[PDB]
Amino acid sequence: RGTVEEKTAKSDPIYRNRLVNMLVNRILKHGKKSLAYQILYRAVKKIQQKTETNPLSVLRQAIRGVTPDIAVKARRVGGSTHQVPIEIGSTQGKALAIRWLLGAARKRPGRNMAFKLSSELVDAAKGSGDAVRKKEETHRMAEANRAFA
């Protein structure tokens, strides 16, 4: 098949941001869009309560520390499987960034999803927790095999 028709991406409902709307679509599970909306804006009203900066700043600065520049694509030549790394694009790194961020945010227990996404989000903002460690363990594997190409 050739290609996908280009893209249509709208901005955030109340902040007019194309990243946070991407994040509210990724936290969506089966159509409950008002509830995912609720979880994200309770996370923003939580992040105004924790520190006192723009949530765009702590969010974008968080996902800069989750986004990888390179990853493992276990490719094949002649039947021989090389673990050769290939440089991932930018918006691909956005989708992977909030991917690991969100799934890792679905592990830290204790309280509702606002506290869970808040806690793993500031752990991304401080280089701790699990999402940026997941960045490292997917980053120190492609670093480990640069002897391929």
Place this chain on the structure above:
Amino acid sequence: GPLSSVKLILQGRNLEVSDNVRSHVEDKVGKSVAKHSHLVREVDVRLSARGGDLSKGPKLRRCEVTLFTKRHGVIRAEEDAESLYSSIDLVSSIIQRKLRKIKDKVSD
């Protein structure tokens, strides 16, 4: 398939199955795919008979053996012979070539 092997499933159509029949099935099929080291999931051996003194047509014994293996696909072999025993030995030979096709194609 006495032990450790793929799961055996018989089908008997138009045929009252005996001890010597399914014993010959597990011993010829199972003991010829006993030098396997294959974790094949499921073997369906469907052993129907037809014709001759039973009905119109020549005397036929027709076996189909199907292997739902993990190892690169599914395979089936249908042979039609004058006896049950010649059917099951002949399908046993065919499935020997098909499994050596699978194992030998895993190379390098």
Place this chain on the structure above:
Amino acid sequence: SARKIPKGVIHVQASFNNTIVTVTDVRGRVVSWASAGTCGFRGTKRGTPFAAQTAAGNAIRTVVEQGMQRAEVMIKGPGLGRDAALRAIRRSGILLSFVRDVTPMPHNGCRPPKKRRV
């Protein structure tokens, strides 16, 4: 130490599955050698252009006690380890006078062994 002269030959035994980056003076007393098996990883990984780059870098990074200006490189043999090694020496950028090949070009001397049939 050594004779302390900043000109000296570099030999790169680029094998079909390995590389060796040795460096020696004009007479031929080696001042350092470092190969793909030297720099850590070993096996099917060694003998790739990353191993040529890392083995050359860890080879000539230890001649900073000399600080050789006038470099000249005398490589040998077939393999995927040549061009990354020359990009490594030009990355260190020291006064590479001339690179050259000294590979054994036989004049039908000995019979090379059986073809592989794999």
Place this chain on the structure above:
Amino acid sequence: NEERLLNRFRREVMRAGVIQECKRRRYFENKQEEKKRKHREAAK
């Protein structure tokens, strides 16, 4: 210096393909006609 490679470029004058030729066995005119027919037609 610049990142130009004239050793590879000059190398194909007398290629290192006389060393991938000489790893495997001395064999007669079947594979010397295959390699030297494909090589007599690669230069023409």
Place this chain on the structure above:
RNA sequence: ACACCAACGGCGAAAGCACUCUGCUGGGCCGACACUGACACUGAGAGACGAAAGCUAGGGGAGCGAAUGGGAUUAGAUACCCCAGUAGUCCUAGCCGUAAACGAUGGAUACUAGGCGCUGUGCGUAUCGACCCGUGCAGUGUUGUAGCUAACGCGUUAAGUAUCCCGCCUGGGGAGUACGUUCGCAAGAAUGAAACUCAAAGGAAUUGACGGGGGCCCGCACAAGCGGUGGAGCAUGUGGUUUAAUUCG
């Protein structure tokens, strides 16, 4: 053992022959009439040579490398892969006499379109000297008319048209085996059946299918996501088991 030179190139009867130089020596091709005057062709049996592997005798032994030995892959591996590695490979003197020893085409003469080539010489042009053009022949190659051929193709180097000479063939197995004999140090080579059995065995071409042969292009086919089944409980269907029947498909 002799890279580049190495060429769809040169020579030999074939096998073969390539680092250079020297010596002895074979054979080919071309011209002049310089000579003889049919001395010609083929060749049973015979004789010689005859790749490689093999064997006797003595040297020599770096690489490679049957057998062997170890490691690996593998259910297994006496094999492909890898590491060692003996005979052998080379030479002297012999024996052996077989090869897909193939151009899968015995030799010789005469005759029958061309195109594009290469090699060797000869004549004329051109210059006066290397070229360069046509050619006279001989040899080597590639497309190709006629004709032949079951077809593919061959086609002045015929598988064409004719003439001569020798060999060999008459269904496939059995079987290049048995027996005998000759040769051979042996390995074996040569000559070479039958009983019985089969209705085929073969050749060239076509159409399909297929290929762990290419080339190209689609498909939620894989990859990227998202969500499940397989785990638990239940609903239901099938197989098996049981029963008088667990209707049949």
